[PDB]
């Protein structure tokens, strides 16, 4: 099972132009909690 | 199982232009908590 | 299992132009807590 | 298991131009706590 | 706006018994990628 | 805005018993990537 | 804005018993990459 | 803004018993990379 296989990159030609404004994806006054695995117990 | 295999990089030609503004992805007044594995117990 | 294999870097030609503004990804007045493994216990 | 193998660096030709502004990724008035392994216990 | 306020801790009496087996929340052969904020650009 | 305020710790009485087995939250053969803020650019 | 204020520690009485086994949160054969802020650029 | 204020330590009475096994949070055969701020550039 390939399980998510792109297998697509032959003869690739492209170009991109990107202009971003202030605070595009910034975080202010934000609280982020992230936990993976482990044991908290209280 | 390849498990997420790109396998796509033959004859690749491209160019990019990127312009960023202030605070694109910066963090101010933000609290971030991150824990992976381990034991906290109180 | 390759487990996340890029395997894509043949005949690669590219160029990039990057312009960054102030505070692109900087942190001010921010509190970051990070812990991996270990035991805290109170 | 390769476990995160790039295996992609044949015939590589590229060039980059980077311009950075003040405080691109600097930290001011920021408190960072980092601990890996070990035992804190109070 | 309280925004997620517990406000509930008056006259609290309780006790807990916890028994854990091996590999309760451990990670083996696992790849974890985590990124908050910032700019990757390729 | 309190923004996540516990405000609950009056007359608190409790006790806990915790028994842990091997590899409760340990990591073996694991690759963890973590980045907060900053600029990678290739 | 209190921004994560516990404000709960009046008349606190408690006791804990903790028993840990081998490799509770230890790391073997593990690769951990951690970067906060700064500029890598290749 | 208090920004993470405990403000909870009045009339505190407690006791703890901790027993640890071998390799509780030790690291063997592990590679840890940590960088905060600064400029790497290649």
Ordered DSSP codes for chain H: --SSB----EEEEEEEEEE--TTSS-EES-EEEEEESSB---
Q: Which residue of B has its CA nearest to H24?
A: B38
CB contacts, 8 Å: A38 with chain G: 25
Location of structure tokens 């609950």: F8
Domain span at residue G22 reads 1-42
- Token readout for B17 is 């232009």
Domain count, chain F: 1
Q: Check the CA dihedral B33-D37-G36-C5 and report its sign.
A: negative
- Token readout for H1 is 């803004």
Say how far apart CA F42 and CA H21 lie, in whole Å. Answer: 43
- Token readout for H39 is 């400029």
- Token readout for C36 is 């991996």
Cβ pair H17:G16 closer than 8 A: yes
CB contacts, 8 Å: H35 with chain G: 34-36, 38
**C-beta separation of H30 from F26 below 8 A:** no
Say how far apart CA F15 and CA G14 lie, in whole Å. Answer: 5
**C-alpha angle C7/C11/C16, rounded to 5°?**
95
Q: Is D8 annotated as a binding residue?
A: no
Cβ pair B37:G24 closer than 8 A: no
For chain A, the chains sharing at least 3 beta-carbon pairs closer than 8 angstroms are B, E, F, G
CB contacts, 8 Å: C21 with chain E: none
**C-beta separation of G3 from H3 below 8 A:** yes
- Token readout for H9 is 């330590």
Q: Which residue of B has its CA nearest to F31?
A: B36
Q: Is G10 annotated as a binding residue?
A: yes
Q: In the 3-class helix/strand/coil scheme, how is chain E assigned residue by residue?
A: CCCCECCCCEEEEEEEEEECCCCCCCEECCEEEEEECCECCC
* Phi/psi at E35 (5° precision): -140, 130
On the 0-12 / 13-18 / 19+ scale of CB atoms within 10 A, B5 is buried
Element (H, E) at G28: strand G27-28
Q: What is the resolution of this structure in A?
A: 2.8
What separation in angstroms does the CA of A33 have from each of B30, C32, E34, E36, G4?
Answer: 11, 11, 13, 11, 12
Cβ pair C25:E38 closer than 8 A: yes
Technique behind this structure? cryo-EM
- Token readout for E8 is 């509930």
Strand ranges for D1-42 from DSSP E: 10-19, 27-28, 31-36
Q: Which of C31, C39, C42 is opposite residue H3, by nearest beta carbon?
A: C31
- Token readout for G25 is 């949160």
Chains G and H touch (3+ CB pairs under 8 A): yes
For chain D, the chains sharing at least 3 beta-carbon pairs closer than 8 angstroms are C, E, F, G, H
**C-beta separation of C35 from A39 below 8 A:** no
Shortest Cα distance from G34 to chain D (angstroms)? Answer: 10
Q: Which of B31, B39, B42 is opposite residue G24, by nearest beta carbon?
A: B39
Domain of residue E42, CATH code: 4.10.230.10
**C-alpha angle B33/B36/B41, rounded to 5°?**
80
Location of structure tokens 């330590």: H9
CA A21 distance to own-chain centroid: 19
Would you mind telling me the total number of residues written for chain F in this entry?
A: 42
Q: Is D14 annotated as a binding residue?
A: yes
Say how far apart CA C29 and CA D26 lie, in whole Å. Answer: 12
């Amino acid at each position: 099972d390939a399980e998510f296989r792109h297998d697509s990159g032959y003869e690739v030609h492209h170009q991109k132009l990107v202009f971003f404004a202030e605070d595009v994806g910034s975080n202010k006054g934000a609280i982020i909690g992230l936990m993976v695995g482990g044991v908290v117990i209280a």
